[PDB]
Amino acid sequence: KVKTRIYFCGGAGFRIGELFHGYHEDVCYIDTSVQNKHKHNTDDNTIIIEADKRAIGMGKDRKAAAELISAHIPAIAHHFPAGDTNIVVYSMGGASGSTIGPSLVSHLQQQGEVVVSVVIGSYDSDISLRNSSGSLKTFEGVSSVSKVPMIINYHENVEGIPQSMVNQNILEVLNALVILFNQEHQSLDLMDITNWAHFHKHHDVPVQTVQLHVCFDRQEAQAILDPISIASLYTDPDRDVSISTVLTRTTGYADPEKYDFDQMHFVINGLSIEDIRKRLEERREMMNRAKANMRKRQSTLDVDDQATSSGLVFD
Numbered sequence: 001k002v003k004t005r006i007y008f009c010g011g012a013g014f015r016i017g018e019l020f021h022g023y024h025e026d027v028c029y030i031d032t033s034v035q036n037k038h039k040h041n042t043d044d045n046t047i048i049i050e051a052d053k054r055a056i057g058m059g060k061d062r063k064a065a066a067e068l069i070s071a072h073i074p075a076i077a078h079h080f081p082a083g084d085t086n087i088v089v090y091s092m093g094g095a096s097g098s099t100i101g102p103s104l105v106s107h108l109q110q111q112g113e114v115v116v117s118v119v120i121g122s123y124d125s126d127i128s129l130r131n132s133s134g135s136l137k138t139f140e141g142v143s144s145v146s147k148v149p150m151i152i153n154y155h156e157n158v159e160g161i162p163q164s165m166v167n168q169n170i171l172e173v174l175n176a177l178v179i180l181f182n183q184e185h186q187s188l189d190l191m192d193i194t195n196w197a198h199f200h201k202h203h204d205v206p207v208q209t210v211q212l213h214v215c216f217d218r219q220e221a222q223a224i225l226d227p228i229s230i231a232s233l234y235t236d237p238d239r240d241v242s243i244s245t246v247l248t249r250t251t252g253y254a255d256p257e258k259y260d261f262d263q264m265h266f267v268i269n270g271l272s273i274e275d276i277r278k279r280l281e282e283r284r285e286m287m288n289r290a291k292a293n294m295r296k297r298q299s300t301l302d303v304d305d306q307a308t309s310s311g312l313v314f315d
């Protein structure tokens with residue numbers, strides 16, 4: 001098994017993967033569109049799921065995408081087998097990443113794998129907000145069905161903010177995660193990472209969506225409310241000090257000769273998910289208000305009008 005398999009799904013996943021290229025060898029790409037392919041997509045690392053016969057995307061139709069892709073998931077998972085750790089990357093407001101991604105997480109978690117999702121919330125229209133809300137609900141559904149808390153590292157496409165800034169934050173996270181999982185750190189074993197992610201095995205906590213916060217100093221980790229499970233890396237072992245009360249804690253000692261960071265923390269909590277739910281709820285309340293206030297014009301047809309079988313009408 002590879003140490004870390006990264007699954008880049010849908011357009012956002014493809015774009016992030018193109019930016020991330022060279023930072024990790026064991027990556028793969030799954031989409032419903034050939035258009036999203038770029039210079040780093042090969043026949044060996046990419047699966048394009050064709051619809052009855054073309055691959056032109058799903059255009060934010062989450063239900064259609066799910067109908068298409070669901071039956072292909074076992075084959076895809078067989079083709080790109082799980083790593084010791086697994087990272088799945090996709091947008092929430094689209095159609096393909098937000099179905100392929102969570103479907104892969106569900107399949108992988110049912111096999112007992114360790115999985116983290118890196119995801120993007122959006123709400124630039126009624127349909128994409130509907131998609132992001134469905135995706136948030138999906139995380140909860142996948143947590144329930146796979147019986148393993150679904151871990152999401154969440155990024156919002158804040159209306160008005162250049163997506164390039166969100167992409168950069170995501171790359172920083174993917175880089176940090178790859179280091180965390182690289183199996184080179186003293187005192188940090190594979191089962192240590194496994195039980196950090198699968199903390200539900202040892203604690204009376206709800207099996208539900210949890211949020212992963214990648215923190216680059218002590219103070220950022222400290223700010224995370226009600227932490228459930230924390231993995232910490234130090235280049236100086238003498239700095240290994242528990243930050244706050246936490247259910248599971250695991251630490252690794254990174255080579256200070258190789259690494260120019262003091263410490264990194266990967267903090268899982270549950271509470272922060274509520275902030276996402278609340279944010280989408282508020283956007284939904286605005287959207288429904290706007291919808292309900294849209295003016296509906298009278299038909300241009302009179303009751304005295306006649307139409308031909310093609311729809312031609314003569315005045």
Ligand SMILES: Nc1nc2c(ncn2[C@@H]2O[C@H](COP(=O)(O)OP(=O)(O)O)[C@@H](O)[C@H]2O)c(=O)[nH]1
Nearest residue numbers: 010011012015091093094095096097122163166
């Ligand atoms: N931050 C960021 N957001 C993206 C990127 N690509 C797409 N998105 C967002 O994701 C939404 C869905 O697009 P896409 O991921 O291509 O949909 P999909 O192919 O059906 O999964 C878009 O409306 C954007 O809000 C990207 O490269 N970076």
